Amino acid sequence: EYAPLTVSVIVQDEGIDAIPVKVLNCDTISQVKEKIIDQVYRTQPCSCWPKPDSVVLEWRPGSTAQILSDLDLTSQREGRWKRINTLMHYNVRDGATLILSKV
Amino acid sequence: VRSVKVVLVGDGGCGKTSLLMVFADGAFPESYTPTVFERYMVNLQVKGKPVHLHIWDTAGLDDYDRLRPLFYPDASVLLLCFDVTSPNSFDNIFNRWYPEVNHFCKKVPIIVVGCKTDLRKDKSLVNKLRRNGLEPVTYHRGQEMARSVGAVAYLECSARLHDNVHAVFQEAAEVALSSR
Numbered sequence: 196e197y198a199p200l201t202v203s204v205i206v207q208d209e210g211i212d213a214i215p216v217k218v219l220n221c222d223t224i225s226q227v228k229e230k231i232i233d234q235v236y237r238t239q240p241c242s243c244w245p246k247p248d249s250v251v252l253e254w255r256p257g258s259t260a261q262i263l264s265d266l267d268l269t270s271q272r273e274g275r276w277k278r279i280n281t282l283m284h285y286n287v288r289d290g291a292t293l294i295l296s297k298v
Numbered sequence: 299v300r301s302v303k304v305v306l307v308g309d310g311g312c313g314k315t316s317l318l319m320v321f322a323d324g325a326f327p328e329s330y331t332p333t334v335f336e337r338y339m340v341n342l343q344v345k346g347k348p349v350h351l352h353i354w355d356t357a358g359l360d361d362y363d364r365l366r367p368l369f370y371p372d373a374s375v376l377l378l379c380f381d382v383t384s385p386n387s388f389d390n391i392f393n394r395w396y397p398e399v400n401h402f403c404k405k406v407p408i409i410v411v412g413c414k415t416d417l418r419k420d421k422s423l424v425n426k427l428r429r430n431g432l433e434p435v436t437y438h439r440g441q442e443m444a445r446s447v448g449a450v451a452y453l454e455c456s457a458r459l460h461d462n463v464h465a466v467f468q469e470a471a472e473v474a475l476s477s478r
């Protein structure tokens with residue numbers, strides 16, 4: 196089996212005292228590194244690092260494309276939270292065509 | 299330079315795409331192909347003034363119900379379509395399409411449209427309906443539905459025969475502009 200595991204990580208350059216990072220004992224050393232980078236550097240200024248919200252995703256099954264979002268007018272609010280839209284929420288079948296473009 | 303956003307909804311196979319292709323490209327499709335979503339842009343005249351038309355062709359199937367509301371925002375007029383030969387599609391005008399429109403588009407004008415009118419004068423088809431105790435939808439029944447739903451107008455057309463096709467969109471742009 197596996198096990199949840201909270202760890203204390205220190206980053207030399209940033210100088211923060213310590214950062215709690217929730218990982219799994221079955222995570223590899225590469226997975227753990229990216230788990231840390233997504234917590235210290237995803238919010239650091241980097242003009243060449245595309246984040247999902249600095250990026251548009253359109254869908255066109257025909258000659259016209261439409262933008263798909265995590266939460267738009269079609270999002271069903273399930274429970275305490277608004278359920279984030281999925282690919283089968285929009286009913287995107289296999290072999291579809293998408294467009295990626297910056298904002 | 300006035301622009302108008304037109305959106306067609308209605309049960310699958312009721313003839314939404316054929317109506318648009320005949321109006322835009324002047325071509326009727328013999329093979330049925332379920333539409334996902336398309337945007338047709340048409341320049342027309344209204345009382346002597348040019349009016350651009352952004353027209354959206356939606357999916358009538360139940361499998362795309364979660365994607366369809368994406369095209370309701372900023373609408374100027376809504377064409378609620380049904381098949382005259384299919385009493386089911388005429389019911390879903392009020393059972394299914396009106397609640398969905400009333401939910402999102404509370405203020406967008408509704409124009410009910412009866413499609414495949416040419417099929418009313420087909421002996422081989424109407425008798426198949428009459429043997430099952432069902433008659434094709436008549437004008438006074440399409441009108442009472444538009445009245446019950448609260449539509450502004452109610453029109454009929456046949457994409458197979460180009461009849462009353464250009465008139466459907468002239469009335470759509472007139473209602474959309476006069477209500478602006």
Ligand SMILES: Nc1nc2c(ncn2[C@@H]2O[C@H](COP(=O)(O)OP(=O)(O)NP(=O)(O)O)[C@@H](O)[C@H]2O)c(=O)[nH]1
Pocket residue numbers: 308309310311312313314315316317327328329330331332333334356357358359413414415416417455456457458459
């Ligand atoms: N006889 C006749 N057949 C028609 C007429 N309009 C459409 N059809 C036929 O009805 C079928 C459905 O046409 P279509 O326009 O694709 O319907 P739809 O509403 O766009 N389907 P969907 O909503 O799933 O995209 C096709 O086989 C088409 O040839 C009409 O005026 N007369």
Ligand SMILES: [Mg+2]
Pocket residue numbers: 314315316331332333334356
């Ligand atoms: Mg279609």
Ligand SMILES: [Mg+2]
Pocket residue numbers: 359360361
């Ligand atoms: Mg189905």
